[PDB]
Each structure stands twice: as structure tokens, then as C-alpha cells.
Design a protein around this ligand. Structure first.
Ligand code: XMP
Ligand code: XMP
Ligand code: PRO
Ligand code: PRO
Lengths: 257, 257
């Protein structure tokens, strides 16, 4: 009784942001999230424009953009609306609730004003979610909880992962899913997004480890692949994005049967 | 064989940043870190100037400063040098190594350029430290690892805390200590800094829980108290800082015997 993305978008308990995402995934035949890990606004925007049709989501690290301004994020929103993808700021909120609400709403980045999705580590306990949701619920935003990590030595295992799932399922008015290496929740309303993905085997020299789209979508049951360098470092980033999209989409179709 | 702060500053394996901190703690009779949780640069700087003589450290959240510029941080450095305190950016790095090195060096905040200390969560595994130290070692900086958290539901317990201690003790050329609620390492070269501190019992409505300076320095064996609202929300922040300084300093003296 695995449902398609389009049917999951209609589930009774679906969050509106998840529904919007699932609908555009189905419409565009993409379950690829581009990790736009660049330092220049122009490169960010040129990638978003060219790759927008191929992606369901663009994941940012706003704090590595040397020339960040709120206008850049307005331009990114225009592209997200045009090409139909969500913006996910990979901020990894990880503080007490009182602090994260200010980090989400305020400062120079004003993340909540432009990010459809953010993520949080669960290590502080559920106050991290409660603090974020005070800003994010009124702004109709969603959050992803980090249930597992791709890096060598990750401590997000075992009871830690189980705690992340419980925290999500108790905050389902705001939490729409997980960053994880596999399916961690059996509830189909929750999205599973998986980083540490490349077509070829390997890793990096700072603890990143890679698995293929077929492995993480098809065997491990995740929904969306998050891909940075496998695309970004390629010469033709559009063709690279298409190869990752086709890989992740077929793996989804073949699991769905 | 508990050593004074001044003697710890001379230990063979001490990190230079820890040594500088311990020396100024001893000189100024302060083991108070102000958590300068404000949104205005002028308030940040006015607090740093007035409270500088009373503190060993000023902890920032640069990402909640509505009017951040690098010039503000230059002015903060002037005050830190004048009054003799270290600047700790409480960024809670918590990503893979390749990402955190860019978040530490780059973007609009250029944290490594002005922060003596930063901190990191250990959940990604030791690549988080390796990535930071690539930037921080050449810049003669130090890092604190989050071994425990003060908030309700914290998952930084048990084997997670032990993993943080091991990670610190294997990266001692860069890691100078811990954020923790108590002493977690028996090695006197490592600093223990404890948030969740107020003179009165209680908490906040988003999971913060408080213990007193006497409890965390005197019974729990920590070195430094980190205090935000207990000072910041008081009318006279200078007198409040002095009350916290005297509390933490006496608790240290009485444990030292
Ligand atoms: O929440 C997360 N949990 C993880 O386990 C994880 N692994 C990688 N990352 C982030 O994803 C991107 C990976 O980029 P690459 O494809 O270039 O290695 C980069 O932007 C990384 O910061 C993670 N984020
Ligand atoms: O690394 C950390 N581990 C913790 O357990 C913890 N508890 C509180 N905080 C931070 O410290 C400050 C506490 O501020 P208050 O005194 O106002 O509650 C605020 O700036 C908080 O962000 C922590 N940081
Ligand atoms: O028509 C559609 O696209 C959706 C998919 C599931 C049922 N209705
Ligand atoms: O003279 C001092 O201040 C240091 C303290 C320990 C021994 N020497």
C-alpha cells in the first residue's frame, strides 16, 4: 500500500508544504533536491534558473554566500515560483528554543521570510522545534528533523534516530519529514530526504560518504536525493542534474511497482 | 591536585587560547561568560564596554544581530582587547566537515576572522572538527564541543557525551574544552563552560532549565558560567554581572580549597 507522491500529497494529515512539494514532484517527475553549495549569488541564481525544471527543491547554505542580500533571495523566490521548486535553507538549527526563534526570524538573513523549509537537529530536545514553530507556523512554513547523518562517526543512530521520529510525529503541524539515510518513519505523510548521494562510489576527505540514488531511493526507501558536488562540480550541471533526476525518479517508480 | 586557573594556564598540553583565557580569569577574578543575546549592535557594544571588566568572555549570536557588519566586530575586538575578554561565537556548527569550513571562514559573517572561540555539536562525527580546524588552526583559534545541553529532552547524554569527550581529546590542537552542565573530562587542560545558569530556580517556556552558579561551579565542577537573561533582562546589567561573577568566583575558590 505504498502510495505515489501525488496520492501522498492528498493524505488527510499532510502538511500543506509537503503537499505542495509532493504535487510538484509528481507533476515534474523529479525527486531531486539540488544542494546549491556555491559562494556567489550569480552562480546560485544561474543554477536555480537552469536546473529549476529538473528539481523539486533547492537547498541553500545562506551563510556561505559571500554576497548575500535579501534581494538575492527575492530573485531566488521568483525562480522557485517560475520553475516550481521549494527553497530549503539547510541551517541545522540546534540551539535552545528561545535562541532558534530569533535565528529563524531575524538577523541579517531573515530565513523564515524566504525559506519554505528549514531543518533542525534534535539533540536539544523538542524545545528546538517549539521555538522554530512559533515563527514558522504563522508563516506557513515547514521543518525537517535530522534523524541520521551521512558522515563518518555520526551519532544520529539508534535511540537518537528514534527520538527524532517521535519528535516529528508529535509536532506534525510543523515538521514535514526528515533528513535521513533511509526511511525512518512508516507514516507516509512524512518526507524523507537523503544527502550523501553520488552516482559513483566514494566520499570526501572530511567524512562525507556516498551512496547511489538507486540505493537510497530504491533499497533504503527514501523519497528525495540531496546532491551537491555530484552536480555542482560537473562541467555541465544541467546534464548532471538530469542524470540524477532520472536515477532517483526511476528508483522511486520501480519501488512503487 | 586541583589546580588554580593560573596554574592550569601553564599546563604542558594547554592550548594557547585556553591559556590566555585562564590567565585573564585569574587576573580579573572572573569566570563569567556574558551571553550577549541582543539584536542591536549598540546594545552589544555598550554591554561589552560596561561589563567587560567583569567577564572572562563574551558569547555572541552574530546571526541575531539585526545590524551586523564586520565593523561592529572590529569595535567588539577593541573592547575585548581593552577589557581583556575572549569573544566566543555560539554558532553551534553541526554539518559535515566540508560545509562547516566555509560557514566558519566565509559568508557575510567571516566568523573565524573575529571569534577567538566557536563551538560545535558532535553529532556529525569528528569531520565537523576536522573541517573547522582547517580554518581555525592557521588562525590560532579554539573550539568548544557541546557535550551536554541544558534544555529539556536533551539527547546529549550517556554515550553521546562520552563521544564528545573522546573527540575533544583526539583533537586537542584545536579543541579547548566543552559546553556541558558539569565536568565531563578529567583532563585539566580542558575548559568546561556551563549555560543554563541563574541565581534563582526556574526555566523558560521553551525548554531552558536553570541551575545556580554555586551548583554548577561548586558541586558539578564546571569552570565558567554562561549567563544571558539573568543579566540581560535585569535593569542594572553591571550589578547583575557582578553578582554572577562573585557567585561563580567564590564557588571556584571554595572547591579549590
Ligand atoms: O542535514 C544533513 N544531514 C546529512 O547527513 C548531510 N550530509 C551532507 N549534508 C549536506 O548536504 C550537502 C552534501 O553535499 P555533497 O553532495 O556535495 O556532499 C552539503 O550541503 C551538506 O552540508 C547533510 N545535511
Ligand atoms: O551550547 C549551548 N549548550 C546549551 O546547553 C545551552 N543552553 C543554553 N545555551 C545558550 O546559552 C544562552 C543561555 O541564555 P539564558 O541564560 O538567557 O537562558 C543562550 O544564548 C543559548 O543559546 C546553550 N548553548
Ligand atoms: O490526479 C492527480 O494528479 C492526483 C494523484 C492521486 C489522485 N489524484
Ligand atoms: O604567577 C602566576 O600568576 C602563575 C600562577 C601559577 C604559577 N604562576
Amino acid at each position: 500500500m505504498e502510495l505515489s507522491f501525488g496520492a501522498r500529497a492528498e493524505l488527510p494529515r499532510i502538511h500543506p508544504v509537503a503537499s505542495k512539494l509532493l504535487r510538484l514532484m509528481q507533476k515534474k517527475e523529479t525527486n531531486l533536491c539540488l544542494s546549491a553549495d556555491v559562494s556567489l549569488a550569480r552562480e546560485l541564481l544561474q543554477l536555480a534558473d537552469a536546473l529549476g525544471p529538473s528539481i523539486c527543491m533547492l537547498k541553500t547554505h545562506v551563510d556561505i554566500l559571500n554576497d548575500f542580500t535579501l534581494d538575492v533571495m527575492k530573485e531566488l523566490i521568483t525562480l522557485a515560483k517560475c520553475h516550481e521548486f521549494l527553497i530549503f535553507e539547510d541551517r541545522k538549527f540546534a540551539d535552545i528554543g528561545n535562541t532558534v526563534k530569533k535565528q529563524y526570524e531575524g538577523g541579517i538573513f531573515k530565513i523564515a521570510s524566504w525559506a519554505d523549509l528549514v531543518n533542525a537537529h534534535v539533540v536539544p530536545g523538542s524545545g528546538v522545534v517549539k521555538g522554530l514553530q512559533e515563527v514558522g507556523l504563522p508563516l506557513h512554513r515547514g521543518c525537517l528533523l535530522i534523524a541520521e547523518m551521512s558522515s563518518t562517526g555520526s551519532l544520529a543512530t539508534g535511540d537518537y534516530t528514534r527520538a527524532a521520529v517521535r519528535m516529528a510525529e508529535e509536532h506534525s503541524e510543523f515538521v514535514v519529514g526528515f533528513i535521513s539515510g533511509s526511511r525512518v518513519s512508516m507514516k507516509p505523510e512524512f518526507l524523507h530526504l537523503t544527502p550523501g548521494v553520488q552516482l559513483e562510489a566514494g566520499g570526501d576527505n572530511l567524512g562525507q560518504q556516498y551512496n547511489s540514488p538507486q540505493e537510497v531511493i530504491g533499497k533504503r526507501g527514501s523519497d528525495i536525493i540531496i546532491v551537491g558536488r555530484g552536480i555542482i562540480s560537473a562541467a555541465d550541471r544541467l546534464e548532471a542534474a538530469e542524470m540524477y533526476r532520472k536515477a532517483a525518479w526511476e528508483a522511486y517508480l520501480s519501488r512503487l511497482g
